[PDB]
Amino acid sequence: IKTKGDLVRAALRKLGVASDATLTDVEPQSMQDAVDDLEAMMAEWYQDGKGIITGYVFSDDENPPAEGDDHGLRSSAVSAVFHNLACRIAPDYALEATAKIIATAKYGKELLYKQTAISRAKRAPYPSRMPTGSGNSFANLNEWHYFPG
Amino acid sequence: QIKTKGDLVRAALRKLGVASDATLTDVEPQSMQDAVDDLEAMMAEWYQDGKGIITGYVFSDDENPPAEGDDHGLRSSAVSAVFHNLACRIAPDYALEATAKIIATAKYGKELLYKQTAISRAKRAPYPSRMPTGSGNSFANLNEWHYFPG
Amino acid sequence: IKTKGDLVRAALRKLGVASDATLTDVEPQSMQDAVDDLEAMMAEWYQDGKGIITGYVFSDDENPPAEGDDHGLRSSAVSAVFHNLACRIAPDYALEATAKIIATAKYGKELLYKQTAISRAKRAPYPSRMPTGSGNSFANLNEWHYFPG
Amino acid sequence: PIQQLPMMKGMGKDFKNADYIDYLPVNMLATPKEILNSSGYLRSFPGITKRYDMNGVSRGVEYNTAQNAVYRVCGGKLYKGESEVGDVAGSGRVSMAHGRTSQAVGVNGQLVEYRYDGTVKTVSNWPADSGFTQYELGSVRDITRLRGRYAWSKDGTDSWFITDLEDESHPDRYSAQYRAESQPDGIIGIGTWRDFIVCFGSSTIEYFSLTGATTAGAALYVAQPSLMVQKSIAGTYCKTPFADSYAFISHPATGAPSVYIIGSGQASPIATASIEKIIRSYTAEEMATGVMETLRFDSHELLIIHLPRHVLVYDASSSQNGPQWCVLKTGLYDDVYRGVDFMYEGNQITCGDKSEAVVGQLQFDISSQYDKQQEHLLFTPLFKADNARCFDLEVESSTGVAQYADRLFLSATTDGINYGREQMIEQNEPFVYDKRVLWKRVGRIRRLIGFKLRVITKSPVTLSGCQIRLE
Amino acid sequence: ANVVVSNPRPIFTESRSFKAVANGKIYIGQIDTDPVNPANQIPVYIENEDGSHVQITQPLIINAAGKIVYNGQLVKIVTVQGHSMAIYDANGSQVDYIANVLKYDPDQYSI
Amino acid sequence: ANVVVSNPRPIFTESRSFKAVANGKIYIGQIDTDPVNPANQIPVYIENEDGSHVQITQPLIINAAGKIVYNGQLVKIVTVQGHSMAIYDANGSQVDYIANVLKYDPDQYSI
Amino acid sequence: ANVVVSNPRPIFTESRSFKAVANGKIYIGQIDTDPVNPANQIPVYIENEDGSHVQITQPLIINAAGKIVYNGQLVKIVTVQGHSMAIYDANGSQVDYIANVLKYDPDQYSI
Prior knowledge:
Chain D: This is Tail hub protein gp10. The structure is cut from a larger assembly and holds 3 copies of chain A, 1 copy of chain D and 3 copies of chain E. By secondary structure, chain D is mainly β.
C-alpha cells in the first residue's frame, strides 16, 4: 500500500514465493533483494526524467537503516509497479511468472505511460520562415514572420 | 446480494473455487484482507482519477479501517465485471490460473463497464477559430462572423 | 419454468452437477450461490436499461427470505437464460460446460437481442439544414427547412 | 484426477507429544471384500439388544461343552443361560473352567465347583486321617482343565496344582505340586493349549505335558523347555485363545507392554505404534485389570481387549496390509464400550454389560445399543497436496434399513489435530437403496488435509471406497 | 456497582460475511448430535417479562436482524440444559454447527 | 430453564463503525494487566468436537464476520474464567482494553 | 478451561433490521415504569478500568457502531439498582423496551 515493504511483499505473493495463502514468511534476505531490485527497476523506468515518471522517490539507502520504507508512488500505479517487480524477480527463485502476471504488467506500464505520453505530445511552433497572413494585428505591429523556435 | 468489498473478494475466491462456502477448508482472513488490497489497487489502476474507467467505486479510508466491510458502491450492473475480473488477479496468488470462461467473462465485463463512458466521451470538438458563420445565420448581423472555440 | 429456483436447478442439470439423472440433490449452498450468480448476470445484461432487456425482475433480497422465487422472464428466453447461467457457473465447480452448452448460450443471447436490435434500429431524423422541396404543403405553411433533431 | 482415499486407518498428530499417531476407525470393521471400485468396505459394529435381565454386572463367560450351554456369572449370581443355578461370592472378574462332572469358577482365592446335580464343593486338602499327601493350597488365582483334572495356581507363587481323578474336590493323591521354576517368576495365569498346561508367568511362558507315569509319587506333568516363550501376560486376564494359540499383553518386566501372539515357542508383535502407546498410557494396576478375549463372527477374527478407558479390537482377517485396530466406544463421548464377555450360543451371539445388570444379544440389522444412539468415526490419512483443489468427495454407502435419514458429519482438518466446520450430509435414507453420499466444493488444500466422517445413527452404516476429485 | 447495562436478545449473523441471517431457522438438540431429529430435539421455552415460561414450537424463526421472533414480537428463548445448535439460513444451507454450548441466564438470581 | 440459547460464536465489531474487524487480533491475559506482553498472556484453548482442549498461539485471528477463526475455520475458543481482552485491528490500532471480563456480567450481585 | 471467550461489550442493533442505532438514546428507569419521564430515571454510573464509579447525565448516547459512548470514548454503564432499559433510535421510536433487565432489583434484594 504505502511502503516499499508492502509493494515487495505483494510481488512475492504474486509469485507465490512467500504469502499467508502459502504459509511462507518472507525471508529477510528476500526482502532486501527484491527491494533492491525494485530500486533498480524504478531507476531504469525513470531514466533521469526523460522516461516514464510515476512519482516514485529513491530513498538513498545511505543514511537510513534500509531503503525500503515509504514511497511517493501514485495510488493508481501500485498495481503496475508491484506486478512488474514480481515479473522481474521471478527468475531469482528460478520461477517464471504466470502469463496473467505478464499481461497485467504490460497493461499497468501502458496505463502509467498513457498520461505522460498525452502530456508530451504537444506540437512544434510554426517554422521561422512561415509568415503571418495579412489578417493579423502583428502585421501592423511589424512582427510578421513567426517567432523562431 | 454482494454489497461489500469483502463480498466481491469472497465471491471471486469462490469463482476460483478456493473458499466458496459449503467448503471444508476456508482461506485465512489475512489472504482475504490482502485480496481486498489487490481489489483496491486494481480499481485505482482502472480509475486513473477522472480519465480512466469510471465504475462508481468508493475507496477505503482510515475512519473505516476494515476495508472489507466498506460498501463498494458499484453500479448494480457493474458488480459482475469486478466480480469476474479480479479473479484472474488472485489466480496466480495460489498458482491456479483462471479458466477460459472467467477470462472471457472478465473481458466482456470490462467492455460493458467502459461502453457507457466511451459513448459519453465522443463530444465532437467545436468549430476551429477560423471557420466563419455563413450569411444564413442571423448572428452574422450581430458581428460574430468567425466561430470562437474553447 | 416460472421461478428462479427452477431456472437455477435447470442450469445445474445441464452442467451435470446435480440432477435426478445423476442422483444428486442440489445443495442449498449451491442453490443460493448460483441464484446470486444469475442475479449478477441479469444485472450485467440489463445494464440499467441501455443493454439487452428480457423482462427479468430483480427481487431485492432485502425484505424476502431469499431472492430466488418467481421471474418476469419471457417464456421464450428461459432456455437462453439458464444455459448462460450454467455456462457462468461452470468454473465454480471446476467443470467446463460442454461445447453444446456454449453454442446454445450464444444462440440464445443472439435471439434475445434480435428483437431489441430491430426495435432500436430506427433512423435519425433529417438534418436541420435539409429543406422541403417545392412540392409540399409546409412550403406554404412556412415550415421550409426540416425541424432540427 | 479422481483419487481414492483409504479409510481403514487414519493418520494424525498428537497434541501432547507432537507425534504422528494412527487415528483409528471407531465402531467400524474393515472387511477385505472387492466392492465396486475398492478392495474393502467399512462395516459398523453390530448393535446390542437386551435379551433378558441378570443380577449385577457381568464377570465371566464360558461355553460349557459338557452341557452344551453357556454358563455366565453376573454380579453375585451364577447363571446357566436364562436359568439361575449357583450362588457366587465376590465382586471382581472370575475365571471359569468347565468340567464333565462339575462347572467351576475360581473366585475369592478358592476354586469353587458347582456340581451338575446341584451340590457345591470347594477344593481343600485331603482329610488328615485319610493318609494321602497334604499340601499348602493357598489362594487360587487362575484355573483350567485338561484330561479330567483342574489346574490352578497358588496366588503370589509359581506353584500350580492338579485335582485327583477319582474325587475332583481334593487335589491329587500323591503328586499334585508343580512349579514353573525355569525363572523366578510367579504364575500370573494358567490355561490349556492342545494338550499342554501353560503357566503364564511374569517373565516366561512355560509349558507342561503329561508324562504318563504310573508309579505313585511320580510327577504327572513334565516341563517342555523347547516350547518356552520368553514373554509374559501383564495381568491375570490379559490372555485368550486366538487363531489356535494364545495372544496376550506383554508384562512390563520384559519391556513396554505390547499385544503379542505365541507362535512355535516365540512371541510375534501384532500391535502398531499407536496401539502400544495407548496401552502404555495406563498405569501398572489399571492395565493389569484389563481383560481380553476372542470374538468370531462372519469372516472376521476379532481379538477384543477391554482396557479401563479403551476397547481395542484386532481384526485378524482384515490385517492384509498390516495390523488393523478399531476402538469401540459407547455413547457420544469417550465412554468405554459397555459390551463385555462375548460368547456365541445357539443362533446369535450374547454379551454382558459393564454398567447395567443385563445381557445383550448382538443384532446385525441395527447398530443401536440397548435402544440408544451410537457414534461411528472414520478418519482418512493425512496426505500432502499443495495449492490443489478438491470438489467431488463421494463415499459409497449401503443405504437401506434405517429409522430416519441419519445424516453424517463430514469435516476436514489442516494440521491433523483439530478440525473445521462440521458439514451434514444424508448418509442413509429409510427404505431407499440407491442414495449416493456426495459432497461438492470441498475447497483448497493449502498444505495438508484430513477428512473425518462421523455418523450418529441407530442403523448399520456401510461405507465403501472414498474417492476425491483432487483437481 | 450492582447492575451493568447489557443488551438482551442476542444477534445471529453468518459465518464468513457480516450479513445477518434473514428468515433463517435455529434448531436445538442434544450434545454432539444432529438437532433435526425429533428424537434428538430438546424442549425450548419462552421467558417473558413476567417470568411465565411457555413452550414453543421447535423450529425457531429469525427476523431480518438476526434475532429470534415468535408471533412477530421479539422473544427470549431458554433451554432446559446444555444443547447443540445447527443454524440454518433461509434457503436451508448451514450457517454453522456447534456441538456443545452453555450460557446460564444472568437474570432471575432471586429465584 | 436456566440456560439461554444465544449467539454461540461471539461477535467482535469495531468501536467507531458498525463493521467486523477483519484480521483483528485478540490477546488474553491476567486480570488488570496488559495482555500484549507474552508474560501476561494466559492459556487459551480451542474446544474441538472431541471434547479436547488444544492450546493455540495467543494472537487469535478475527475474520470479516466478527467471529474468532483459527488457521482454518470457526472454532470454540475457551479460557479459564478471568480473561482480559485487547482487540487490535490489522492496521495496529486499539479497539478494546476490557480489563476484567468477569466484571461485565449483567448481574454482579451474585459475584 | 471453563468459560467460552465472548465479547462482553454490548452492541445495540435495531430490532426490525440489521443496522446500528446510530446516535440513539438509552434511558434507564425504575422497575416497571416508563424511563422517558424525567422522574422515572435512577442515577446512573460509569465504571472505569481502575474502578472509579462516576455519575453522568441520564439520556445516554450511542455512537455509530452501537456501543455506548461518553465524551467520544467507550464506557461501561452501571446502576446501583435493578432498572428497566428503554432504547430509542435517533429519529425517535421505541425500538426496544425491557421491564426488568435482571428480573429482580439487586438493591432491595440485597436487603
